Amino acid sequence: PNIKSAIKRTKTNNERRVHNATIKSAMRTAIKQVEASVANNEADKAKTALTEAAKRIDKAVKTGLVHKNTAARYKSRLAKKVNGLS
RNA sequence: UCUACCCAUGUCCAGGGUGAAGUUCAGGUAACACUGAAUGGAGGCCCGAACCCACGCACGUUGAAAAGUGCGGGGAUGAGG
RNA sequence: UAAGGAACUCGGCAAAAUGACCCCGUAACUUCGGGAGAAGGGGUGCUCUGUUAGGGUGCAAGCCCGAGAGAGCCGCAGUGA
RNA sequence: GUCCUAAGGUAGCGAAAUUCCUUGUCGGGUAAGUUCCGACCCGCACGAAAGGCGCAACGAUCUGGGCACUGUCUCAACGAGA
RNA sequence: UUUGGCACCUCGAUGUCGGCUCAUCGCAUCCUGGGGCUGUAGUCGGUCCCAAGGGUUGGGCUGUUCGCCCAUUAAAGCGGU
RNA sequence: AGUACGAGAGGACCGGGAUGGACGCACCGCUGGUGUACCAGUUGUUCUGCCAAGGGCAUCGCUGGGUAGCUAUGUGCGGAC
RNA sequence: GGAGAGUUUGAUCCUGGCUCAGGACGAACGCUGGCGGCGUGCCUAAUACAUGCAAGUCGAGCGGACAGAUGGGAGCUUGCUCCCUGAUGUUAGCGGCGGACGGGUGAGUAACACGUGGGUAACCUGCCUGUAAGACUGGGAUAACUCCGGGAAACCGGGGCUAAUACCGGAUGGUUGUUUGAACCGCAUGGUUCAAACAUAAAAGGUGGCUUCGGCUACCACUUACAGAUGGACCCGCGGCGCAUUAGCUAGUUGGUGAGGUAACGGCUCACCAAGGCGACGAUGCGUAGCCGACCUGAGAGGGUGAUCGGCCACACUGGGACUGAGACACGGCCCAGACUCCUACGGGAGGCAGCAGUAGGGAAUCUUCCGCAAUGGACGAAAGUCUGACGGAGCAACGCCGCGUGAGUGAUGAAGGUUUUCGGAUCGUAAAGCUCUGUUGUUAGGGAAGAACAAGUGCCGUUCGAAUAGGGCGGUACCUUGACGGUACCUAACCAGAAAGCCACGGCUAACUACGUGCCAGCAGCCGCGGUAAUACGUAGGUGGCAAGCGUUGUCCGGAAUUAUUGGGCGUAAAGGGCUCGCAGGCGGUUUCUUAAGUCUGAUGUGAAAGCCCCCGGCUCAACCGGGGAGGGUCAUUGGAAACUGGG
RNA sequence: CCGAAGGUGGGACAGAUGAUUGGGGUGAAGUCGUAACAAGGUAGCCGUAUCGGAAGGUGCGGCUGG
RNA sequence: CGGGAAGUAGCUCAGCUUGGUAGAGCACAUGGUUUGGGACCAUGGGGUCGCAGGUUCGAAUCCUGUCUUCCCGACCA
RNA sequence: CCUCCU
Ligand SMILES: [K+]
Ligand SMILES: [K+]
Ligand SMILES: [K+]
Ligand SMILES: [K+]
Ligand SMILES: [Mg+2]
Ligand SMILES: [Mg+2]
Ligand SMILES: [Mg+2]
Ligand SMILES: [Mg+2]
Ligand SMILES: [Mg+2]
Ligand SMILES: [Mg+2]
Ligand SMILES: [Mg+2]
Ligand SMILES: [Mg+2]
Ligand SMILES: [Mg+2]
Ligand SMILES: [Mg+2]
Ligand SMILES: [Mg+2]
Ligand SMILES: [Mg+2]
Ligand SMILES: [Mg+2]
Ligand SMILES: [Mg+2]
Ligand SMILES: [Mg+2]
Ligand SMILES: [Mg+2]
Ligand SMILES: [Mg+2]
Ligand SMILES: [Mg+2]
Ligand SMILES: [Mg+2]
Ligand SMILES: [Mg+2]
Ligand SMILES: [Mg+2]
Ligand SMILES: [Mg+2]
Ligand SMILES: [Mg+2]
Ligand SMILES: [Mg+2]
Ligand SMILES: [Mg+2]
Ligand SMILES: [Mg+2]
Ligand SMILES: [Mg+2]
Ligand SMILES: [Mg+2]
Q1: Which of the 8-47 residues on chain A come under 7 Å of nucleic strand G at their beta carbon?
Q2: Secondary structure of A3-32 as H, E, C letters
Q3: Distance between CA A32 and CA A22 in Å, rounded?
Q4: Would you give the DSSP letter of residue A78?
Q5: Which UniProt keywords apply?
Q6: Is A28 exposed, middle or buried (0-12, 13-18, 19+ CB in 10 A)?
Q7: CA R_g for chain A
């Protein structure tokens, strides 16, 4: 940039994204664990995965990444699959 | 007995493609036109071996041969061989 | 056969290049048939899914034909001559 | 106007498979084009079934220009066989 | 070296234009070397003299020789065989 | 030496030095070319009984490389004094 | 609430064009030019840009340098030095908010972009202000600073550290999801309210004062729910461009089903199915264009425009993409590509004037490289304040509109003085000659604006919190303070009406003539037309109606033009009946009665911003201007009637 | 995987320009004839054909606006 | 390159071949004409013969050079 | 058969 607070906002936002991507990745990985568990026929693990998923989901909401409606949509999708197993 | 043309009588032409007329059905109109689809299988039609021809080049030129060979080339259901 | 690429030559003569199948796509002009394989592009091996879908034959068993997909694997290159 | 004729060449095309002069002139294409294409018309010496002018398709036809392609060439080198 | 004149060799054959390949010779010198004169200030030139050692381009058009043109070059010589 | 010369424009001789073009000689260390008794990949079919691994033929089957040798477009040197 | 005129003929009536008088403007060009007050000023090249400036702030988040010194210390030339970290200050760097606003331009867009229409049951909604729970308990890293290595460099990578109101762990959290049922229902998809379980999810403290040093506070402020509000998103009816010498278009195209994505509904994306969708009521294509409030014109219907000013939209050197978040898929960011500018010792960096000024270029043509945040509004902050080319001012330019003027008034020589000539004149002309009276303004010196509300700082008092008298905040209440313009507007007072009149037109339309010089020449011309040796329209010279420092000329639009005719025209001979049928669609349709109620009509309710123009219109001395209450505004909803007529049975 | 820019290709459309060529308009006093307007000296005009320097002529059919 | 032919007023041409004379048409100017024109009629002005040299008593004329413009010719089998 | 321009 050619402004002081622009150069800060350049340097800031890069460092934010890295940290932010972590939590999305963590969430998406935690979502994959639940999805993977449906194939293997193992509800007991899927519940314990869904908690860790739900934690990682809601951490992104706090930071300001996943919208409350976005989170609402995900936890819906997962819970229907878990109940659809039994 | 070569060759030109003709006459009688035989015979040959691997394969593949294209898709004329007609027909049927559907649409279509007062009738016809006309349209589509399917079917159909025309042609000195197409690509291409055999076969027939002989366009280009090279070679050969006291030749392997008094007209050929090699590599390409043209026709190849026809006014065909 | 380096680099170049018709500068050669009367003249690209000769040679090189193109070349199969499937798919996409294809202008002027036209006698409405054509032009047309116009042009220009893409795909092409092998393995598994797979004795695939589907088809022929058969009472079946079996034998034969066989797309199109998906996932891979290898090479400089798969109509590998 | 005048002379001559049987009648004086229409349409179309034209430096042409025809044009001597001639590489006509102008334009196009090329760095450069006696060839080629388009124009023009002083047609030496086109011209209407010894047809005129066009024309899709067709051609081992002739001509000019491109892309590709190459030992055709710059300029030649090596290898195989006879 | 031209066009010719003559008709002497060759009509029981002296292949005939241009190009390609290979040159070689002359000098009336295109370039380079050396000079004189200049209407030679310089840089360039002009003109004549000496000099034949070596050098003297690739293309477009045309069968062309020649020529014109493009682009170069120190120069793009003229002739004989 | 922007010296001489010239109003300027321009712009030398003579003398130093560097580096080319064309031409020639040699040579393969380098860059490349070729390299049919080198190495490798690969198609079809056929043979070594079969598998695996190989051989034959298909332009050296084709394709990618390549040693020596021979080579130019490559390198060195020459026409100096 | 609506005016015509000239011009076809020898003359006529008609048809028919042409031209003129009006108004308008972002104007340009001539010639000319005094001042003032409001307004306006790249319409061309969304061309390229030298230079400067246009968004920075919070030290009461922050460790840290670097200062401060109230004091002790301080060797001692009283000259200078100092050793401790004073209250606290300056705040590179970290963290927060803003930077998505404000400002600019209209390139693209024929589209739910816009103007008038819904879900809000398809959404979102930080900040602000309420009502409703909390900041409890885990640490671990990292800038700066330093150490090391780079970079001539520009810029930067490692190492050990340190902080934070930066970040992450865990409990319990009404939100959220899931499930278990209810309650209650709508416009189908449903929605709203309640209860338990399972799962998940919270914070942050920095200031000043008081601590009984247990803590308890309070402005600020961190975090959670139900609100309100605000600003966005999607969807839809209906509207508003040209060309058929553009007739077929489409293949995620049209619908389904499923999956995914999205704040959100949805071919929005994809998989798998079908075969649809659109179009003569104009699809598709091409062209042109931001739309609207409005603006110009007109009796109105209409027509044209969409500079300035307000709203919606779109864009930000060209093009693509996401990140951050409540919110850009960024106007002074980044990532990548491209064309241009800059730097680079060549490895690599930096930027986008459609921000204000300015430059070049283009062009008929459009400003100052200005001063100030005093005012208004922002951002930041608790505040002081800082930043603000937004904004206020000023510069420039007759580019508009208009001021109130540039006097009033007494005064007949009709003088002076003019160009004509029937050698005489006549009009300007009560206007000046000679004045003589007043200060709208200004000719020069003295007074002097308003604009300023203040915000705070301070002093006080009711209220609510307060362990509380702390100590602040919020209602009434003092005191306090600041002006770019600018010593500028406006007043007084002289020198004094001195400084302040103009331009254009004068055949006719449309109120306004003669000498001379040309001689179809030179020239003129909106139209009709003038000039060939007596030119009331040409060259010159002397002479006069409108509006008022300008008005002529050219350009554009509406009018006149009942001249595209719905209002409001035509087709025997002026332009105009298809050569004539058969007919698809379409348009139109006898009489009665019944019924219907789409059209038709009608009542009631909601919106159609602000400005502008306008009805009453007021205020500012009237103005060249600002406020309120109305009205218009709809082929518009929703609902209740009426039912003759048109339509349906 | 998608994907801007770029590359390649064959078409579509629009503008500019082009040797030359075609009519058209305009232009005080050019050349040729005299076609039309009168029965315009062959009544004219419409469609069509053909011919001719040029207006035009001629055929066929039509019209009266003879 | 060689050979021809031109070159005369503003423009187009005679005169050149046989030496003595500068003409013609159009344009230009003036007059006539007419209201004024146009056309027509009459009357003028305007070169020194592309440039230079030569021969001659004397050169547009004959000879040469030069410049400009045309025309013709220019292997060979 | 024709009858210059204003
Ligand atoms: K050639
Ligand atoms: K041919
Ligand atoms: K002989
Ligand atoms: K070698
Ligand atoms: Mg055949
Ligand atoms: Mg064949
Ligand atoms: Mg053969
Ligand atoms: Mg080669
Ligand atoms: Mg090569
Ligand atoms: Mg050649
Ligand atoms: Mg050659
Ligand atoms: Mg060949
Ligand atoms: Mg030529
Ligand atoms: Mg060639
Ligand atoms: Mg003949
Ligand atoms: Mg004959
Ligand atoms: Mg003899
Ligand atoms: Mg003999
Ligand atoms: Mg000699
Ligand atoms: Mg070796
Ligand atoms: Mg080698
Ligand atoms: Mg094997
Ligand atoms: Mg064998
Ligand atoms: Mg064999
Ligand atoms: Mg636009
Ligand atoms: Mg009207
Ligand atoms: Mg008539
Ligand atoms: Mg009529
Ligand atoms: Mg009729
Ligand atoms: Mg007549
Ligand atoms: Mg007659
Ligand atoms: Mg005749």
Answers
A1: 8-17, 19-21, 23
A2: CHHHHHHHHHHHHHHHHHHHHHHHHHHHHH
A3: 15
A4: H
A5: Ribonucleoprotein, Ribosomal protein, RNA-binding, rRNA-binding
A6: middle
A7: 17
Residue A1: how many other CB atoms lie within 10 Å: 10
Strand G close to A70 by CB, under 7 A: yes
Question: Which amino acid would we find at residue A35?
Answer: E
On the CB side of A86, CA atoms within 13 Å amount to 9
Q: What is the resolution of this structure in A?
A: 2.3
* Burial class, A81, CB count within 10 angstroms (exposed 0-12 / middle 13-18 / buried 19+): middle
Report how this structure was experimentally obtained.
cryo-EM
- Measured from the Cβ of residue A17, the count of other Cβ atoms closer than 10 Å reads 11
Three-class secondary structure of residue A66 per DSSP:
coil
